[PDB]
Amino acid sequence: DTICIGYHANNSTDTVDTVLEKNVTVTHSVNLLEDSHNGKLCKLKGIAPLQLGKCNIAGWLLGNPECDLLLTASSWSYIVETSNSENGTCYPGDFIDYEELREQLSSVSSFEKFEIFPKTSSWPNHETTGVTAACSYAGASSFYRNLLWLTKKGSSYPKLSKSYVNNKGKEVLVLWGVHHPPTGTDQQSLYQNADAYVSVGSSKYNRRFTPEIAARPKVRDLASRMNYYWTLLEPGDTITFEATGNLIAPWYAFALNRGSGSGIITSDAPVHDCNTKCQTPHGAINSSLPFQNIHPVTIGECPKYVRSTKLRMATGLRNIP
Amino acid sequence: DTICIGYHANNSTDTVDTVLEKNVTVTHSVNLLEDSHNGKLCKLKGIAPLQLGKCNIAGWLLGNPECDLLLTASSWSYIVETSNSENGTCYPGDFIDYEELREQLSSVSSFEKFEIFPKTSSWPNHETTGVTAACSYAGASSFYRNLLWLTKKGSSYPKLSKSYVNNKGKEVLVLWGVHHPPTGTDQQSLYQNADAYVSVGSSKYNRRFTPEIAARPKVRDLASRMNYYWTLLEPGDTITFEATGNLIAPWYAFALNRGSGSGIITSDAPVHDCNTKCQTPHGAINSSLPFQNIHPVTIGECPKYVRSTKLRMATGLRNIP
Amino acid sequence: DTICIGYHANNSTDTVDTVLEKNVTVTHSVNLLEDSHNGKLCKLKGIAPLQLGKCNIAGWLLGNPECDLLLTASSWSYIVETSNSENGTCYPGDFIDYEELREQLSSVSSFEKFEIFPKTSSWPNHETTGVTAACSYAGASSFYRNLLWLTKKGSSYPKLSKSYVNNKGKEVLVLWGVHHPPTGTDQQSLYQNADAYVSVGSSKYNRRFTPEIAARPKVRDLASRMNYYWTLLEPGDTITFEATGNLIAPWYAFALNRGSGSGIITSDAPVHDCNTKCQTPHGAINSSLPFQNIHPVTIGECPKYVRSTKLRMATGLRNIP
Amino acid sequence: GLFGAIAGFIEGGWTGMIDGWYGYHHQNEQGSGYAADQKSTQNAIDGITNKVNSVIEKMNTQFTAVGKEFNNLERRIENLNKKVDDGFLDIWTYNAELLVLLENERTLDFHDSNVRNLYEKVKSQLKNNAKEIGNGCFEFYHKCDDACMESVRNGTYDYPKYSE
Amino acid sequence: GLFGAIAGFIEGGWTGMIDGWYGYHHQNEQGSGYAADQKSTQNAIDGITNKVNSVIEKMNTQFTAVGKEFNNLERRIENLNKKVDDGFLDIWTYNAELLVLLENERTLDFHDSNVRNLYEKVKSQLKNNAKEIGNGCFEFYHKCDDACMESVRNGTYDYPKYSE
Amino acid sequence: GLFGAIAGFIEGGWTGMIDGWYGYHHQNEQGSGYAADQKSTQNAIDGITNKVNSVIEKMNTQFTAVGKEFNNLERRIENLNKKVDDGFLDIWTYNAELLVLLENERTLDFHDSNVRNLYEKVKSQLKNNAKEIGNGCFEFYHKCDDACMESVRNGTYDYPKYSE
Ligand SMILES: CC(=O)N[C@@H]1[C@@H](O)[C@H](O[C@@H]2O[C@H](CO[C@]3(C(=O)O)C[C@H](O)[C@@H](NC(C)=O)[C@H]([C@H](O)[C@H](O)CO)O3)[C@H](O)[C@H](O)[C@H]2O)[C@@H](CO)O[C@H]1O
Ligand SMILES: CC(=O)N[C@@H]1[C@@H](O)[C@H](O[C@@H]2O[C@H](CO[C@]3(C(=O)O)C[C@H](O)[C@@H](NC(C)=O)[C@H]([C@H](O)[C@H](O)CO)O3)[C@H](O)[C@H](O)[C@H]2O)[C@@H](CO)O[C@H]1O
Ligand SMILES: CC(=O)N[C@@H]1[C@@H](O)[C@H](O[C@@H]2O[C@H](CO[C@]3(C(=O)O)C[C@H](O)[C@@H](NC(C)=O)[C@H]([C@H](O)[C@H](O)CO)O3)[C@H](O)[C@H](O)[C@H]2O)[C@@H](CO)O[C@H]1O
Ligand SMILES: *[C@@H]1O[C@H](CO)[C@@H](O[C@@H]2O[C@H](CO)[C@@H](O[C@@H]3O[C@H](CO)[C@@H](O)[C@H](O)[C@@H]3O)[C@H](O)[C@H]2NC(C)=O)[C@H](O)[C@H]1NC(C)=O
Ligand SMILES: *[C@@H]1O[C@H](CO)[C@@H](O)[C@H](O)[C@H]1NC(C)=O
Ligand SMILES: *[C@@H]1O[C@H](CO)[C@@H](O)[C@H](O)[C@H]1NC(C)=O
Ligand SMILES: *[C@@H]1O[C@H](CO)[C@@H](O)[C@H](O)[C@H]1NC(C)=O
């Protein structure tokens, strides 16, 4: 009797927006917006992030005594800090170009700590035993594990000269410090020489330091200050330390091969053995879709961040059951 | 007997552009582009901007004698400078991290000037009377209102130590200066000590200054120079000044709560009691439309700047009377 | 009898992509993507680029002996360095604010090199002949052409004082250097004065330099270092040099009017006489189309760079022969 | 016109019709006049209103101070800052210009479609009871008064009554 | 509807047809049932699949660390950095919102077009051998069995055979 | 095709017609040949020309040096700079790729629409003086000579003349 032309309908409650009409019910649709995450900090490109425990990057690099090493990994795809990374420079002072260093260490494919200037054999003419209550471990005065405090031996502080040649076949991160006594008497008590200087040089690096002696508000019960410096020593190059005083000497340094393009995430979300191509501070997200509203600051190959709560694309047609 | 299907027409001369055809006359249309302004500098977030009159920010903070002091409101949403703000540092020299400071003051609540080191009681062992013809007021040699020039009293300049503890419950902006004589003789005549230094420190801030003595051209008839420094002292923290010479000491300082996300406008447009969500150097504009061609550099919640002279959207249809 | 309605067809194999279907063959199409370049470095704004040959910008400014045969125009729209620009600072050390200077010289409209402190009349009591094997030319020890190495004449290095007043009616770029011997013996051997200083001042510039004497890894067989400084001297201003040693003195300086908005191109492509609105390191490109896949780094008024290999716009219709 | 009605087989608009975008002109013994179809007009107004509001409201903004101040040793980051502002300028200008061009085309097409749909809606219900002239009018084969004309406009038109 | 079929002269959809987007319902003395048109349905699916894939796959992604750290003397470049992220945020939010709004409209239009094309495709071959009611149906003036119905759905329907 | 003519009920194009995009093929006793419709072709050419020019000319930029140089203690602002260049690159690549996809679709739709509009205009004036095959042709029921053929193309075709 009759044949009829028509179209599909179903029980779908899916809605989309169109330029002419809001909230149109369609038979089929797809989501273009990634609105969920797994609540975890995951491995990026198959590689776990660096976890610092109780310490921030400065505390970790300088060897703050509160940083117990789990034999920290030899590589990381990015770095995680938490609300618990408290233990920094325990001796008060400035860490120079600290943000630059954090950025340049954000990813590495190889990382090793090694003893650059062995405590026992390196300083025959100087005292190595200096400690402070400001850096304490197990209820006793102590010092950074990766640096050595050089003071005068027997009323004398001769001019020291110490060089390291980088045969590691990769960059060596060398950190050191310069101590600034509160008074002239203390300067003399420690280094003997009021005129003391510190000189550090390589092929690409040249800098001279002199003691700044001043009384200053006590921080961790210290009116003195200790400033921290670093350089990345290129493979094959040499670094030379020369000092008549105030040098807080490298003990351990770090040989490493830098990656690039990574960064630091600050989050208390738990680190897991999961894998992601895109990490956010809230958690990892799937990277398949073009847009995500989870977080603007991300690391990985990530969907573009948008404020949209809903982006839904009609595939099927108007649903009219 | 007939019935006809047809469409609307009117006397509208409104024209729009289409991808297929230019200059199509339509019955109705709406404007997407904000091309006008009110020629005024208005309040942002319900608050008037800071106006500095004859002075720039440096002159105001330091208390250049030509600038009207104490007149600052306790809050502002942004800062206005004019073609007439000429009065800066009347004593020639460098204002260090000046742009940073301007940025940090761009919006503030709870702003107050106060006397951090009262002239009469703070320095019994040094002369406070130093002035210069370079900063003149009322036909007499004078100086910055917020700083003090400390020189030796009776051939001697003893070691000074002065501390301020911040009990104000908000940030304290402390400004000071370091004087740089042209010659060694001037150095001795003023401060007695050739080896003189200035040290300034707090919990988070440590810096040492020494005079840099060099022959150099007269500026505002002065061969000497004076450099200006500042820091933000946190609530509860202490700042300590130590000097054997050359310190241009804080007299007045500033307590404040910094805002964020604001900026500085340079314009000669008059300030009024009007309110706007978007301020431009030419004047305020409505923020309702998505685009504006008035000016690329704005402060507020603003339409996107475009080069377009015309963006007009067809609503009604082709007008064919 | 019959009449038929139909559409055009041809042998055109041109294909385009559409949102519904890939690789549609159409009768007519136009290219929106600039996919070709001319393989030449051309003039921008009617003006040729500066080409430095064997030298980088540092070598050119300092007058590295390998840069003598360069012929510099009085103006350039941008600067070209090549893979062959190796000849820099041959005496090892730091060039201060080097990236900034390169940026600010990227375009210039009136450039003249002139003799700021004539070699013959300026230094009667100091030796001007100092050279080094590190700056060797044609196998013989040499030095920068635009600076003079001042050493002691006979047994003494008296205090020198030299001022230059800028009568050029434009900015004058002044470069100098400060030498840092490895040992006190060398310091004494060159300048005799262990306590030596260098002082430089102008209306905007105030600095005193002292030699930093330290042993350092050898670069080009030199354990010493030489640092390079510069300033733009405003019209009418004066710059004054005073030294008891270690000054590498200005010989030639540069009067110029800085342009703006340009930059530096690194390319091995030949410079030719031709004009473009858009220059890339691979070559000049047509600026007519909105997009280009030639190179991400451009100078000019340029099509937007895209990763697209193909952007082809259908003009005609579906081709169905 | 994409749908071939406006400036199509219907060549011009009616200044006589003030109450809507689309509508009817009727002439019978009882009189004449223009009457706008409110259903198709109000839907068109709703659609276009939504489009305009979408273009305006979808724009999201935060409080921003665009300007930055740099000293004479900061030229590189000053120009970085300028590159940002200029890049945004190129993007927003291009997208705004093209968005308006493209959507104006679609808006006019939309009206062209609505007229045609209305025309075919009336033509469908009248069937052979009237003849189609081709200018968008229909000559009736029967008598249609103001009550009958309203039935066509209302979509309630009764075909079998007038079957003639 | 732009093409006037969906929610058009065809007022509603069929929950009864589960195997496709567009299709046929036939009723004769021999029985009734729904049948989806396989040609037009798969063509639409191919097209929409390409559109969705285009929107998703044209997006380019490289490894990027968005975050940056600045100290308390770096406020200016910190806010410059923020201006970049927020500017990109404004651009992508706006373009994504409008792209979805605009293309959802076009997708619905596409379906409306496909239905109308099918309707007129069947109407073309049937000619006067059937009666057009409205509503998307056709009353045959002859007897059409399941073999005849299948010829209509394939478009192989034989007109000269049924006279009348 | 959205409008269903091109690759629609009109199945293929004419290599024989060299003088336009759309046109006519006529067969009578006096002869046969192709003739392009100048009105619809020229309107389309004007429109597409405007579209292409719009996409090209709306792009405006200032003199810019993209490259920047940073030292090894400037890594952060170097990567900021890189984020800017790469962000602009992502935006322009995505928008350009989609702009071409979307507008190519519309251009083909535009041509498809023009053919149908032309087809229905001829069908409108011919009415029952010719029979509609469904392949895009019309068999005349009367004599159509070159003067008659031209009247159809010119839109001046007179129906009552040929009721025969
Ligand atoms: C050089 C010296 O011993 N000076 C004595 C003052 O330090 C001392 O004043 C008090 O010192 C307290 C800090 O003491 C230590 C510490 O940091 O724990 C003791 C450490 O053994 C010592 N380390 C070394 C290698 O000598 C360390 C060091 O002197 C400073 O860190 C150098 O700046 O000091 C605490 O800060 C008190 O607030 C401070 O007043 C006085 C009084 O006992 O005697 C001085 O001889
Ligand atoms: C230390 C001193 O008195 N030096 C004398 C030179 O100043 C003087 O050179 C003349 O100095 C003129 C400026 O004199 C003042 C000023 O700034 O107006 C006078 C002020 O009382 C004095 N202030 C203080 C606290 O001492 C001020 C100060 O010394 C300098 O500004 C600091 O450098 O100097 C002016 O520049 C003339 O152009 C200049 O010739 C010479 C010659 O008379 O004698 C020096 O003893
Ligand atoms: C002043 C002088 O001649 N001093 C002698 C030292 O130069 C020499 O140390 C050796 O110097 C080697 C390089 O010497 C040159 C050079 O080519 O750079 C020779 C130049 O004539 C000399 N230039 C000037 C103006 O005097 C130059 C200069 O002294 C250095 O640049 C110093 O900064 O040195 C090479 O570096 C060797 O490694 C180094 O040992 C010692 C040898 O004991 O004798 C000194 O008299
Ligand atoms: C590593 O970080 C921890 C903090 O999580 C440090 O432990 C404690 O830090 C608090 C500050 O929140 C110190 O408080 C101070 O205590 C002294 C007396 O104990 C008092 O005089 C001060 O006014 C203030 O209240 C606390 O001393 C400190 N505890 C210890 C055992 O030092 C820890 O010091 C950090 N360690 C290193 C090596 O950085
Ligand atoms: C990403 O992994 C798969 C593949 O897209 C998907 O099923 C999953 O839901 C995504 N991850 C999350 C957390 O949604
Ligand atoms: C700025 O103030 C100084 C004195 O403090 C005065 O010499 C100068 O004239 C003032 N500015 C102008 C433009 O006059
Ligand atoms: C912006 O201008 C006024 C604000 O005074 C507002 O009423 C108006 O609606 C806005 N402009 C447009 C085009 O909406």
CATH code for the domain of A221: 3.90.209.20
Ligand 1 within 6 A of CB of A186: yes
- Strand order across the F130-132 sheet: F31-36, F22-28, C2-7, F137-140, F130-132
**Residue C64 half-sphere exposure, CB side, CA atoms within 13 Å?**
22
- Closest Cα in chain B, distance from residue C209 (Å): 9
Taking each helix axis from N to C end, the angle separating F75-126 and E38-57, rounded to the nearest 10 degrees, works out to 150
Interchain CB contact of D90 with C (< 8 Å)? yes
Q: How was this structure determined?
A: X-ray
What is the DSSP secondary structure assignment for residue B289, as one 8-state letter?
S
- Do B96 and B228 meet the contact criterion of CB atoms below 8 Å apart? yes
Question: Based on the domain organization, do A216 and A88 belong to the same domain?
Answer: yes
Measure A136 CA to ligand 4 centroid, in angstroms: 10
A221 at B interface, C-beta within 8 A:
no
Please say which residue of B232, B251, B272 terminates a domain. B272
Dihedral-angle region of residue B68 (phi above 0 means left; psi in -120 to 50 means alpha; beta otherwise): beta
C247 close to C3: Cβ distance less than 8 angstroms: no
Evaluate whether B244 touches B197 at the Cβ level (below 8 Å). yes
Spatial CA neighbour of F76 closest among A102, A82, A76, A57: A102
Phi-psi region of A261 (alpha: psi -120 to 50; beta: other; left: phi over 0): left
Q: Specify whether B122 is located in the same domain as B76.
A: yes
| Ligand 7 cavity residues, CB under 6 Å | B 31, 286, 288-289
What is the pairing mode between strands A79-81 and A50-51?
Answer: parallel
CA of residue B304 relative to chain centroid, distance: 25
How far apart, in whole angstroms, are the C-alpha atoms of residue F66 and residue F84? 10
Which tokens sit at D24?
């009817």
E16 CB contacts (<8 Å, ≥6 apart)?
E25, E34
Whether C205 and C247 map to the same domain: the answer is yes
Domain that holds residue D31: 1-164
Q: Which residues of A touch C93 (CB under 8 A)?
A: 206
**Which partners does chain F have (≥3 C-beta pairs < 8 Å)?**
A, B, C, D, E
CB atoms closer than 10 angstroms to residue B235: 12
Count of positions (residues) in chain B: 321
Q: Is B103 on the interface with E (CB under 8 A)?
A: yes
Given a contact cutoff of 8 angstroms between Cβ atoms, the answer to whether C225 and C233 are in contact is: no
Q: Are F9 and E116 in contact (CB under 8 A)?
A: no
Residue to substitute in B143, B186, B227 for testing ligand 2 pocket (most ligand atoms within 8 angstroms of CB): B186
Indicate left, alpha or beta for C227 from its phi (over 0: left) and psi (-120 to 50: alpha). beta
Is there an atom of ligand 1 within 6 Å of A190 CB?
yes
Same domain, C265 and C287: no
Residue type at position A13: T
Q: Which residues contact D10 (CB under 8 A, 6 or more apart)?
A: B5, B6, B7, D115, D119, D135, D136
Residues 6+ apart with CB under 8 A from C225: A201, A206, C92, C93, C94, C179, C180, C216
Q: What is the DSSP letter of A48?
A: P
Does E93 contact A262 at a Cβ distance shorter than 8 Å?
no
CATH number assigned to the domain comprising residue C277: 2.10.77.10
DSSP, residue by residue, A236-285: T-EEEEEESS-EEEESEEEEEEE--S--EEE--SPEEEEEESEE-SS-EE
Choose one of A34, A41, A278, A286 to mutate for the ligand 5 pocket test, by most ligand atoms within 8 angstroms of C-beta: A286
Looking at the structure, tell me whether residues B25 and B115 fall in a common domain: no
d(CA F57, CA A139): 75
Question: Is the separation of the CB atoms in B192 and B152 below 8 Å?
Answer: yes
Written as six digits, the tokens of D85 are 């502002």
Question: What tokens appear for F69 in the block?
Answer: 């140089």
Structural domains counted in chain D = 1
Q: Of B102, B104, B108, whose CA–CA distance to B81 is shortest?
A: B102
The answer to whether residues C260 and C120 belong to one domain is yes
Q: Are residues F93 and C306 in contact, defined by beta-carbon separation less than 8 angstroms?
A: yes
Query: Domain holding E17: CATH number?
Result: 3.90.20.10
> Which ligand sits nearest to residue A90's alpha carbon?
4
Residue A209 and residue A321 in one domain: no
Helix (H) or strand (E) holding C149: strand C147-149
Q: Coil, strand or helix: which one is E91?
A: helix
Q: Give Cβ neighbours of residue B1 (< 8 Å, ≥ 6 apart).
A: D27, D28, D29, D139, D140, D142, D143, D144
How many angstroms from the chain centroid is the CA of residue A305?
24
C67: Cβ contacts below 8 Å, ≥ 6 apart: C52, C53, C54, C55, C59, C60, C87, C145
Rg (CA), chain E: 26
**E127 and chain B in contact, CB less than 8 A:** no
Per the structure, how many domains does chain B have?
2
Resolution (A): 2.3
Using DSSP's 3-state secondary structure scheme, residue C210 falls into: coil
> With an 8 Å Cβ cutoff, is D46 touching chain A?
yes
CA distance C262 to C259: 8
Distance from CA of A121 to the nearest CA of F (A): 33
**Cα B33 to Cα A304, B22, B194, C308, F82, distances in angstroms:** 27, 18, 66, 32, 32
Record the tokens describing residue C111, joined without a space: 């450039």
| Cβ of A135 below 6 Å from ligand 4 | yes
Tell me which DSSP letter residue D135 carries.
Answer: S
Query: Token pair for residue C217?
Result: 């890894």
Asked if A307 is an interface residue toward chain D (Cβ–Cβ < 8 A), one would say: yes
CA–chain centroid gap for F151, Å, is 25
Q: Within this chain, do residues B115 and B132 fall inside the same structural domain, yes or no?
A: yes
Domain that includes residue C105, residue range: 42-272
- Do C203 and C115 fall into the same domain? yes
- Regarding whether B18 and B47 lie in a shared domain, the answer is no
Say if CB C155 and CB C126 are below 8 A apart: no
Ramachandran class of C200: left when φ > 0, alpha when ψ lies in -120 to 50, beta otherwise: beta
Using DSSP, how many helices (H) and how many strands (E) does chain A show? 4, 28
* Contact indicator for E44, A282 with CB cutoff of 8 Å: no
The torsion region of residue F127 among left (phi > 0), alpha (psi -120 to 50) and beta comes to left
What does the block give as tokens for B118? 């009262």
Q: Using alpha carbons, list the distances in angstroms from residue A293 to A38, A280, A282, A296, D54.
A: 14, 11, 11, 8, 20
Surface-to-core class of residue E159, CB atoms within 10 Å of its CB (0-12 exposed, 13-18 middle, 19+ buried) = exposed
Helical segments of chain A, H only: 57-62, 98-104, 119-122, 184-191
What is the 8-class DSSP label of residue D6? B
Reference B114, options B252, B230, B249, B237; nearest CA is B252
Report how far residue A311's alpha carbon sits from residue A315's, in angstroms, rounded to the nearest whole number: 13
β-pairing verdict for A108-115 and A206-209: unpaired
Question: Cα–Cα–Cα angle for C75, C76, C81, nearest 5°?
Answer: 135
Q: Which of B162, B242, B150, B159 is nearest to A225 (CA)?
A: B242
C152 and C222 inside one domain? yes
> Quick one: CA dihedral E132, E134, E139, E145, positive or negative?
positive
Residue A288 makes CB contacts below 8 A (sequence gap 6+) with: A34, E56
Q: Are residues A150 and A263 in the same domain?
A: yes
Cross-strand bridge partners of residue F25: C4, F34
Buried b / exposed e across D62-79, counting CB within 10 Å, b at 16+?
ebbbbbbbbeeebbbbbb
Tokens at F141, concatenated:
């029921």
Residue E152: what are its φ and ψ, rounded to 5°?
Answer: -70, -45
Q: Which two structure tokens, joined as six digits, stand for A152? A: 């005068």
What is the phi-psi region of residue B253: left when phi exceeds 0, alpha when psi lies from -120 to 50, beta otherwise? beta
Residue A35's alpha-carbon distances to A44, B156, C320, E92, in angstroms, are 20, 72, 45, 16
Burial of residue E139 (number of CB atoms within 10 Å: 0-12, 13-18, 19+): exposed
